[PDB]
């Protein structure tokens, strides 16, 4: 029945000031201090600081005492973060989590995804990575480059091929946008016969993409 | 107060035991607490004050220790249970430090990558850049090397690679390379190729094509 809600994303630009928010329930919210901590990808977790909702008493770790704001709002049972002049180190999942009574961090947030960066919204531009030529098994895909932000979704043939994909971590290039691929790998004696179809979704720029990969000629 | 966890790595098989270790740089009684971190999800609280089990955790996780050397153990590991694990200190002041985190990995028998290459597409040299692509498929363990030749010159510094997460049915890893250029560059070079390295194959392998 505890529970913390967290917003999933925010995006906001270099230099600007961000709050995150962590709304409770299921428990007297009061009596536990909230804890939050940062976690970059493929990072470990560190935590940032708390806040007892009680007593406005707070602490930080040494990198945030000079980063971060925590406040609540007891009557709506939300404590919240404020990041300020943020730059690209601050981009990273910020959970909230709620001490318990012996200590140790016994309820967690879903985590917001806080983006930071310059780039403009921009749908991907689709490429096929065409099948070898010159065939046991063989191998294609699709180059999905230059969006923001994360994430697209890919499947193939619109659904109908999902045994043999892998669709990759997504990479940030040194333009700020993304770049991401997807492969699979078919029996090549259906390369002359079997339609493949990649199908990209960028959600947040309302970009749909449909790129048949062929061999070449 | 610094808390370690000194493997970051470690591989296990299904119905075996695992041992994952944690180090308080201070007498701490028993106030460690183990988190369990899933790919995509946060963390969970699995165990508190070295040993206790929160409600509905399953049997198979355990923890003792006390004072400073503390151990977190699964008795015999399910395939579910591929995660991060992560120690907390949480005895008396603040900074309530984690420790680095330990992932675990499934172990199986050595598998050499298949390899493929992928020439820029005509519709991307149109518009101006060119991206060459290597793909090294299904191999085990993770521990991989791609190195893009273009006319026997090795390249520095415009590549990016990503790793898959492990396979969760045949336990492989796969791993995607993209040489970048511009359209220039890359019209004014004749041969492609990447070089493979891994344990799997006795020599370095490579796939290369001709710009023609």
């Known amino acids: 029945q505890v529970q913390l809600q967290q917003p999933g994303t925010e995006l906001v630009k270099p230099g600007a000031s961000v709050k995150l928010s962590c709304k409770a329930s299921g428990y007297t919210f009061t009596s536990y201090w909230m804890h939050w901590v940062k976690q970059r990808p493929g990072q470990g977790l560190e935590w940032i600081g708390e806040?007892?909702?009680?007593?406005?008493?707070?602490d930080f770790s040494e990198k945030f005492k000079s980063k971060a704001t925590l406040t609540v709002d007891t009557s709506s049972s939300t404590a919240f973060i404020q990041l300020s002049s943020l730059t690209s180190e601050d981009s990273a999942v910020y959970y909230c989590?709620?001490?318990?009574?012996?200590?140790?961090?016994?309820?967690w947030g879903q985590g917001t995804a806080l983006t930071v960066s310059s780039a403009s919204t921009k749908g991907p531009s689709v490429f096929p990575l065409a099948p070898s030529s010159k065939g046991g098994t063989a191998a294609l895909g699709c180059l999905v480059k230059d969006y923001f932000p994360e994430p697209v979704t890919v499947s193939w043939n619109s659904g109908a091929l999902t045994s043999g994909v892998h669709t990759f971590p997504a990479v940030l290039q040194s333009s700020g946008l993304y770049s991401l691929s997807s492969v699979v790998t078919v029996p090549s004696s259906s390369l002359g016969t079997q339609t493949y179809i990649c199908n990209v979704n960028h959600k947040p720029s309302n970009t749909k993409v449909d790129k048949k990969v062929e061999p070449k000629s | 107060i610094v808390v370690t966890q000194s493997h970051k790595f470690m591989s296990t098989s299904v119905g075996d035991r695992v041992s994952i270790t944690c180090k308080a740089s201070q007498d701490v009684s028993v106030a460690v607490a183990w988190y369990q971190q899933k790919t995509g999800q946060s963390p969970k609280l699995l165990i508190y004050?070295?040993?206790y089990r929160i409600t509905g955790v399953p049997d198979r996780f355990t923890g003792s220790g006390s004072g400073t050397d503390f151990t977190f153990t699964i008795s015999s590991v399910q395939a579910e249970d591929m995660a991060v694990y992560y120690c907390?200190?949480?005895?008396?002041?603040?900074?309530?430090?984690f420790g680095g985190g330990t992932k675990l990995e499934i172990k199986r028998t050595v598998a050499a990558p298949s390899v493929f290459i992928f020439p820029p597409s005509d519709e991307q040299l149109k518009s101006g850049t060119a991206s060459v692509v290597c793909l090294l498929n299904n191999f085990y363990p993770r521990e991989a090397k791609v190195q893009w030749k273009v006319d026997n010159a090795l390249q520095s510094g415009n590549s990016q690679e990503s790793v898959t997460e492990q396979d969760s049915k045949d336990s492989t890893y796969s791993l995607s390379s993209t040489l970048t250029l511009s359209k220039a560059d890359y019209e004014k070079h004749k041969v492609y190729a990447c070089e493979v390295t891994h344990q799997g194959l006795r020599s370095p392998v490579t796939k290369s094509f001709n710009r023609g």
């Open positions: 806040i007892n909702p009680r007593n406005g008493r707070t």
């Open positions: 907390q200190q949480h005895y008396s002041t603040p900074p309530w430090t």
């Open positions: 989590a709620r001490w318990g009574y012996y200590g140790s961090s016994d309820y």
């Open positions: 004050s070295a040993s």
